[PDB]
CSV table of C-alpha atoms and ligand atoms in Angstrom, one decimal:
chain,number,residue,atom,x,y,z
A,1,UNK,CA,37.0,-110.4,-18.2
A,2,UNK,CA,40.5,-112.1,-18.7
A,3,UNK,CA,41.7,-113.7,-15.4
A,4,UNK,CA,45.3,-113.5,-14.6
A,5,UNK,CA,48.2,-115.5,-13.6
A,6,UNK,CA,48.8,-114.0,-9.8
A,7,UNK,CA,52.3,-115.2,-10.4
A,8,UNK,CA,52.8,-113.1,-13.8
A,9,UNK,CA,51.8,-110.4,-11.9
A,10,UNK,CA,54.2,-111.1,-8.9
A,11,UNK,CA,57.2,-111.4,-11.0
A,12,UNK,CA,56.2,-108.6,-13.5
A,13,UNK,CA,55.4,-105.9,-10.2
A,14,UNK,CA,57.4,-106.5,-7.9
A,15,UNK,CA,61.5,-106.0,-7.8
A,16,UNK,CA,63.1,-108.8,-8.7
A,17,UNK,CA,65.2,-108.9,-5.6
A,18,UNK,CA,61.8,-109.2,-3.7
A,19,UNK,CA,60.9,-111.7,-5.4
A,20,UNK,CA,64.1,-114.0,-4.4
A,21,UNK,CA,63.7,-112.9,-1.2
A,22,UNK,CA,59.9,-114.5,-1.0
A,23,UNK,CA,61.1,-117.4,-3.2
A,24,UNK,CA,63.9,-117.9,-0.6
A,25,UNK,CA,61.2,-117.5,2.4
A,26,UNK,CA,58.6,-119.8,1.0
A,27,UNK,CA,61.7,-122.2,0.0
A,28,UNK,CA,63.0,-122.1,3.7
A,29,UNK,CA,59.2,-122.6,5.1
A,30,UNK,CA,58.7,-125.4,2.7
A,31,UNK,CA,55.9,-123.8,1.3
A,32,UNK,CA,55.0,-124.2,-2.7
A,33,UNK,CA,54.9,-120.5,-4.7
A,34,UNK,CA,54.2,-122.9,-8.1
A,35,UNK,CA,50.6,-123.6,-5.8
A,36,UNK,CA,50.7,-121.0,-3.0
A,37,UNK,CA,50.9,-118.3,-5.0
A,38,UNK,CA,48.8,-115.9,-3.3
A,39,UNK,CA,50.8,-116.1,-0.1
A,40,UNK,CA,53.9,-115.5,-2.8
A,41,UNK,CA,52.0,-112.1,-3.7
A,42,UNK,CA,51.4,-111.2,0.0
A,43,UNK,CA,55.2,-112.3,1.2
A,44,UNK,CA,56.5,-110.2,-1.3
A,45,UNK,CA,53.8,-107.2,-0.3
A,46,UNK,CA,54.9,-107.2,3.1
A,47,UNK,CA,58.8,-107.4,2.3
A,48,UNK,CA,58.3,-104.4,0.5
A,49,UNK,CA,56.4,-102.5,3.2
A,50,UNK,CA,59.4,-103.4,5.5
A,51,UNK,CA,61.9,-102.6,3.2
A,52,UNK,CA,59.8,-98.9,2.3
A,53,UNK,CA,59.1,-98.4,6.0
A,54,UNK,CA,63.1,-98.9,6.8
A,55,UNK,CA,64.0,-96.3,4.0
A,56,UNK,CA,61.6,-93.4,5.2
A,57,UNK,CA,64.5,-92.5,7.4
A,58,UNK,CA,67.7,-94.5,7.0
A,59,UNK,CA,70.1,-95.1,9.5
A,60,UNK,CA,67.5,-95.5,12.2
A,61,UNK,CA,66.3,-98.9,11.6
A,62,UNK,CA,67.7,-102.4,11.5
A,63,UNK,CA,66.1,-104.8,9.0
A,64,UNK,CA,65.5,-108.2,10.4
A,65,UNK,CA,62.8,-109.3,7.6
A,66,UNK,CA,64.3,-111.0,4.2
A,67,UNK,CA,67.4,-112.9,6.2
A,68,UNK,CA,67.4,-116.2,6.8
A,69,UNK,CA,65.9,-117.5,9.7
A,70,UNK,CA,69.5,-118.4,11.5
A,71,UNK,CA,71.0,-115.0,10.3
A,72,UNK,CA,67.9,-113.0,11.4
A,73,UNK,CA,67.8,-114.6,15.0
A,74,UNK,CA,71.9,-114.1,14.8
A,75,UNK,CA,71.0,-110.2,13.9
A,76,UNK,CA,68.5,-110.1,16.8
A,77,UNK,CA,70.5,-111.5,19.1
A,78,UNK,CA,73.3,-109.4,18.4
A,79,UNK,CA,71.0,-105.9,18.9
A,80,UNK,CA,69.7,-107.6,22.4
A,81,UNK,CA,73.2,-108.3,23.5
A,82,UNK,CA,74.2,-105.2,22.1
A,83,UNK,CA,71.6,-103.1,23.1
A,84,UNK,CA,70.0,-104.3,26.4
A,85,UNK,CA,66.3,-104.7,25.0
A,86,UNK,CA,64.2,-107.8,25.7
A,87,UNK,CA,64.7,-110.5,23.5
A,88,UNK,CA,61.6,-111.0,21.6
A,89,UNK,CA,59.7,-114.6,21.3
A,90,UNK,CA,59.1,-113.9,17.5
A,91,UNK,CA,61.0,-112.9,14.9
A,92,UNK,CA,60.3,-108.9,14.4
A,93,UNK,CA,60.7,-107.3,10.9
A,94,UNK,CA,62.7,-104.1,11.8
A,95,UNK,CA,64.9,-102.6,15.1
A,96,UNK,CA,64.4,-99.1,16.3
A,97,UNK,CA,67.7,-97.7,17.0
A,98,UNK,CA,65.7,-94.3,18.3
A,99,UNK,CA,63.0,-95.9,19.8
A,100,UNK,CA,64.9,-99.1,21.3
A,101,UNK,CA,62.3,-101.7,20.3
A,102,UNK,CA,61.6,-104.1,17.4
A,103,UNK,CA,59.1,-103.7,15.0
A,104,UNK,CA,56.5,-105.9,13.9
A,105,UNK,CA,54.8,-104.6,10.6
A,106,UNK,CA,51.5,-105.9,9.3
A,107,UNK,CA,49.4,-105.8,6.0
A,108,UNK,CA,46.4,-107.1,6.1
A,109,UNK,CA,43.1,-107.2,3.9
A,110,UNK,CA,41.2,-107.9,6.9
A,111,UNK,CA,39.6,-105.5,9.3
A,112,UNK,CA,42.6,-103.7,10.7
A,113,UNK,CA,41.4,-103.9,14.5
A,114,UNK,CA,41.3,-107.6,14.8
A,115,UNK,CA,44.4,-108.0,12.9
A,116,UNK,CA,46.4,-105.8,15.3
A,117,UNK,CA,44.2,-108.1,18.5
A,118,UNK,CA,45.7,-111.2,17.2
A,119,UNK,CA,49.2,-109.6,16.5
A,120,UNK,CA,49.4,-108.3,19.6
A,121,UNK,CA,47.8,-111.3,21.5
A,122,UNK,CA,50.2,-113.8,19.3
A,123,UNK,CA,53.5,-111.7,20.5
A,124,UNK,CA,52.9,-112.0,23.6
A,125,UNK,CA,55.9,-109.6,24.2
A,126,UNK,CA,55.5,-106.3,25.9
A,127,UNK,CA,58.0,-103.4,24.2
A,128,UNK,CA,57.7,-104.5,20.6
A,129,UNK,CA,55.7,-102.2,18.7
A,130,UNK,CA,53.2,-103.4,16.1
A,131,UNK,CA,52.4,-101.1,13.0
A,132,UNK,CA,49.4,-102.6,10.9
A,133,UNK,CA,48.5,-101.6,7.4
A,134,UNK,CA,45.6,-102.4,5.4
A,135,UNK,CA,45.1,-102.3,1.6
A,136,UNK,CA,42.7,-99.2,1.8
A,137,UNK,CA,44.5,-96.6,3.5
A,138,UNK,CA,43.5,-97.7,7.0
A,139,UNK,CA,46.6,-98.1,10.1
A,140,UNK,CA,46.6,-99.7,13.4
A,141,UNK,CA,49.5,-98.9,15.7
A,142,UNK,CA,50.6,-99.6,19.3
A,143,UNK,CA,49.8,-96.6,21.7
A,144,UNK,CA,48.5,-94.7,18.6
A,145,UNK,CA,52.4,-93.8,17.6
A,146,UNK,CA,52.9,-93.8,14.0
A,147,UNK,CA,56.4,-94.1,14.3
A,148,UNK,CA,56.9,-92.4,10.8
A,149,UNK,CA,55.6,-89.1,9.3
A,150,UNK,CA,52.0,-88.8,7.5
A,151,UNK,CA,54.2,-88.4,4.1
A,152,UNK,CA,56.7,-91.5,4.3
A,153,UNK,CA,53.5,-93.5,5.0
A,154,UNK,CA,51.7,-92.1,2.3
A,155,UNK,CA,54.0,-93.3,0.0
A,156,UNK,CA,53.5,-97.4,1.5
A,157,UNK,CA,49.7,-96.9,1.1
A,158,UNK,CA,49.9,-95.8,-2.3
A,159,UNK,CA,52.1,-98.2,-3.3
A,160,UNK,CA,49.5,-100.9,-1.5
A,161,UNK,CA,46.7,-99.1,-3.4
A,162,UNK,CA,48.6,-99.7,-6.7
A,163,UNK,CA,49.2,-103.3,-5.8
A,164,UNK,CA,45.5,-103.4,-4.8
A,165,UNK,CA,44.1,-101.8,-8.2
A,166,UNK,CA,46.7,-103.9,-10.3
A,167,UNK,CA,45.4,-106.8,-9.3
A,168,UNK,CA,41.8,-105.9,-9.7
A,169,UNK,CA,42.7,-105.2,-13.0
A,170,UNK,CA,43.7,-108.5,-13.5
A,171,UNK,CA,40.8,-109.9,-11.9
A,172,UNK,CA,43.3,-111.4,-9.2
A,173,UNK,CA,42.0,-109.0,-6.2
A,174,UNK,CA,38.7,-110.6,-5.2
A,175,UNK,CA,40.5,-114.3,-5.1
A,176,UNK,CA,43.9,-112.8,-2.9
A,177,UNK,CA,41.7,-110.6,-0.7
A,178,UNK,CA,39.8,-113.6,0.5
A,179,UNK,CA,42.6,-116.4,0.9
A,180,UNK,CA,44.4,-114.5,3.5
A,181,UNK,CA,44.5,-117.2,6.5
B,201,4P8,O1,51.3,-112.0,4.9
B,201,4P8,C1,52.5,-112.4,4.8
B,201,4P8,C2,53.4,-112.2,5.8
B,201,4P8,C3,54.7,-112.6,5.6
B,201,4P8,C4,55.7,-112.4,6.7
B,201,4P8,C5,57.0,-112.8,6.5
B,201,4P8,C6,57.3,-113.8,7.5
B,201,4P8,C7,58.1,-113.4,8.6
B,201,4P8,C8,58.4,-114.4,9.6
B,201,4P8,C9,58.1,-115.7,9.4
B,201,4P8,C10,57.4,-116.1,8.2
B,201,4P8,C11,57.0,-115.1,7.3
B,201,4P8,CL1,56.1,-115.7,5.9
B,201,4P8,C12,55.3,-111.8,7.8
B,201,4P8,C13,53.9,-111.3,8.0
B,201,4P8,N1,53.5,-110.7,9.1
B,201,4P8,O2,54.4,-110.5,10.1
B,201,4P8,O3,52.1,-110.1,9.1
B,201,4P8,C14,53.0,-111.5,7.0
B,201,4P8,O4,51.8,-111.1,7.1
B,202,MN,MN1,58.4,-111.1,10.4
């Protein structure tokens, strides 16, 4: 039918903070939204996975995704020195104040086994945990912990399957699902 602008639908589903926060992040990374706009949808996807995954249980977990880059590394540095826990190569998304590790969260529309592989193999650090979601329900996590209850992650796959069907309704899903990497 009638294709759609992906960025129409970024700014018109997604909170407009989110949506500076992605502008500020492609901005910083000298990347295009105006061109890249696909990778605008999917930065914006995965700040709001952080930011849901953070408020299934506030007070536990430091957010280190949406900062920029020197505050972020300033943040991290601070929990490490603060905290005693390796300091990781990468930038994580979240800290685990229970669990004493970082967090690195996924969403991918690729097969969800691979994705965590090349996570996991482009880390290269030991105690982070990586938490992987895909746009059909499916998860990937380190030593099969899940970290969060099967409700709180219910929510984050809904809301992926409402992005997911949005799009398709706006003929935008079979373009973004295919231009990841
Ligand atoms: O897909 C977008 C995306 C954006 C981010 C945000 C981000 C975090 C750190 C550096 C650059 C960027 Cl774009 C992170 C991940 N990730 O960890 O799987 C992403 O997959
Ligand atoms: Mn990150």
């Amino acid at each position: 039918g009638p294709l759609g602008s992906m960025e129409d639908f970024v700014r018109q589903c997604f909170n407009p903070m989110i949506v500076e926060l992605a502008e500020k992040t492609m901005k910083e990374y000298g990347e295009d939204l105006k061109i890249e706009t696909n990778k605008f949808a999917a930065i914006c996807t995965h700040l709001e996975v952080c930011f849901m995954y953070s408020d299934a249980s506030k007070h536990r977990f430091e957010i280190i995704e949406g900062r920029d880059r020197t505050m972020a590394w300033t943040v991290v540095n601070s929990i490490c020195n603060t905290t005693g826990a390796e300091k990781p190569k990468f930038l994580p998304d979240l800290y685990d104040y229970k669990e004493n590790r970082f967090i690195e969260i996924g969403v991918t529309r690729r097969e969800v086994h691979i994705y965590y592989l090349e996570k996991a193999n482009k880390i290269k650090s030991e105690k982070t945990h990586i938490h992987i979601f895909s746009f059909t329900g499916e998860e990937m996590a380190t030593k099969a912990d899940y970290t969060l209850d099967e409700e709180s992650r219910a929510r984050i796959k809904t809301r992926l399957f409402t992005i997911r069907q949005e799009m398709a309704s706006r003929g935008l899903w079979d373009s973004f699902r295919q231009s990841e990497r």
